[PDB]
Symmetry: D4
């Protein structure tokens, strides 16, 4: 019935409970599946024109099968951008790769009220590089 971390990750299409990802903007995140359909990790935004680039912010969400959603609040020790984003989407095998198709909403303060900017990210699974040394 209830999914373990590994089974939840396998049902999403990934071997490991920890998984590294990059999107089309070069933005990166780590996804960690846990108990009760949970998802945790960290997101680094490298999207052109976005404040709060280049440092990690925590993410939390939930998953079932190929489907996922997660949110990031743009708050950490380095920089706050007074906004939060949630992604929702699904996972598919796209060759020997694994991708995630998502759409996202970013809620933030505009000139006269709150606004919500929409977008779309496609994430690509990154194989853990076992380098064998820290030289080069």
């Amino acid at each position: 019935q209830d999914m373990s971390p590994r089974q939840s990750a396998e049902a999403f299409g990934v071997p490991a409970v920890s998984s590294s990802w990059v999107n089309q903007d070069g933005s990166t995140m780590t996804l960690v599946f846990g108990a009760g359909n949970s998802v945790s990790g960290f997101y680094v935004n490298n999207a052109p024109g976005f404040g709060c680039q280049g440092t990690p912010y925590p993410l939390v969400g939930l998953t079932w099968g190929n489907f996922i959603g997660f949110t990031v609040a743009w708050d950490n020790a380095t920089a706050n951008c007074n906004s939060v984003t949630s992604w929702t989407g699904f996972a598919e095998a796209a060759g020997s790769d694994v991708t995630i198709v998502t759409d996202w909403n970013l809620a933030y303060q505009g000139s006269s009220s709150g606004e919500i900017q929409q977008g779309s990210d496609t994430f690509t699974l990154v194989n853990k590089a076992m380098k064998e040394t820290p030289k080069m």
Copy 2:
């Protein structure tokens, strides 16, 4: 420094760490602010045409200030609709009322392919009903 539950709730616009809400469809949810910008609670969906209606599903998200994001996976002990939804939005006063303006995304399995349906929910704060009795 960092936001306590009461502080986080206050910053969002609500006097108490737990809060009940209802949207335009009669959908209901409870929101509980915790530490490190966390958000948890339960969602009961009463949206016309939606397949997992009437029972509570866990939600989890994050907040900062007036801004919020959260996710429900459509899986509990009563019913599974093989899908997840994420909401993102902001609080704002509408008189002595408090509302949450959100846009949402629902990722689910279509005929051949993953699909993302989109929409908007507005939530209105519901004061804890204080009866002296369970009799009518």
Copy 3:
């Protein structure tokens, strides 16, 4: 020695650690077996004339074998009816169905004095509804 969740669930008569139930009134609850004979879940009361209807309230109890007891306090973020109810009873097959035969007591505030109302609920196990989709 001591009962694990799955073991405790099995001994009670149910194949899975989480289970959904409905009584004669359409009242619903979820039951989750844990360690040390524990029982937890949520109750939604739809009993005619009852003042805290339609929303979930936490329950907690204990089990051994076919036998169970649990309590709900009529307090959540939506509504408070200044009362608590305890159920006690046993599981028994009724064909391929599983039922819980319970008697209950509700302690509440009357006109001058604390009062205890009594009754009987029968619960019937509800199989997890497995849709491929949230669309209809």
Copy 4:
């Protein structure tokens, strides 16, 4: 909004988060109020004609204001009686004392099926005796 252990105990009518009690049969229990309306402790049954007399069994329940319910499974390391009892009731000041009026149901295995035996216990608060020595 949410009650602390002390406030929950005060709302029940007792100074301390821990409280000792004796009923009309000389049965004894300890009540420990916790967070989220919780109640834990231990029950020793000295009721004429009951197996499982004279050792403590854990209790769990919930409370709001003067109202309480809690259950005991007749299982511990000393003796199992394959049954569980839940009490429900209310607290009142009865002179300088504090009492609890409860009714209870005991679910157990009868000769041809499950049965539920009802009863009534009145518990009296016992002041912690500070003896000042273990001699006499």
Copy 5:
């Protein structure tokens, strides 16, 4: 080689992680083996001349192999005797019973001074009584 609860209990000479015991005075206790050599449980003193008889008091201690030590502070919700006792000893076969042979020290306040009383309790293992009705 770090011991599990079952392994620790088995090395002490009992089949199970929880065990019930009785000493020469009718005093009773429950022993629970944990991780890191740990021991917890509950003690009921029915020794002639001791205050603080007839109610359970937490115990805590450690074990290695056949050897054990544990302490009870004479403080619970019912009564405080402003004193503590420690037991130290060993398990041994006495026929097909299992016993624990122990010496004990009780520290308490005398007429002018701290004092330490000493003696020996021998404990015999009690099989869990499976009565399978609470009738008798």
Copy 6:
């Protein structure tokens, strides 16, 4: 009501929750007062003729007022002496000149059966040395 760590320490006659001690043989220990009468720490045995000397072994016990009991199992990652000891005793406080008078029992394997050796240690409180460099 319940005793806090600081309160439990102050009652015992020491101004901090963590405290350092040495006995007549130069054996040393640290005592950490916690919730629920609890006591934990480490013991370093420098007693002539004892086999498990010079390394720290965990202790646990309980306290009330100026009374205390604790045990040490003679098992850690350096050496095992297949034995356990418990101390019971009382504190005697004049300012920062604080002593614990104790008696102890050592249970171990003799040549033909279990045996218990008795002894007395006097512990004296060591004021934390605040040296401001590791240099000499």
Copy 7:
């Protein structure tokens, strides 16, 4: 006198429990002071010639007063450089900045042998940037 997070951070010379830092190479880290002298956080290496650049790696360590030590294992979901680094050093005013002066050792596999590289990083405290829109 046992230090709280805020007290520990203040003794190190930073206002807050979390802090962001940058070293002479553009490497970045986040420091989080906890209880029991503890330190945790995340490190991003942008040092010239180092593998495992540009992603966050957990750190952990301890502190007393102005003094700190911490370790990073070069392993995360993105990349493993089969090596670990520790930093040790002290905080000092440099103008109205706050710096940490540190020496470090990196242990890694060389052509035949374990090897240890050494150097110095100086870290400067970065104020949290409150941008209050994610635009730019």
Copy 8:
């Protein structure tokens, strides 16, 4: 995937999760491998000329493979030396003849500012002595 405690130890070259060590100066420590690359334990400093000798101080660090880093803050309940040290190094394993080659840095208060002393320790693994009595 993620490394278990046992796996992390085996990778480091030691057969148990808890392990005892001694360096050239007779300083001793215990190393405990846990989840997430984590390392904890205690360090006893017997180095000539060092101010915080003969008592255990906590360590924490991280490991990957045969590489390790850990720090000790020179603060405990016996003595504070207002300084911290970190070791980094690698294990060298031939059967049960296992060594850790390390280098260390000691940060402390000099006469005019912070200073960092460097050194090298070689640790050698000590096989847990299984002595079967505390007697000699």
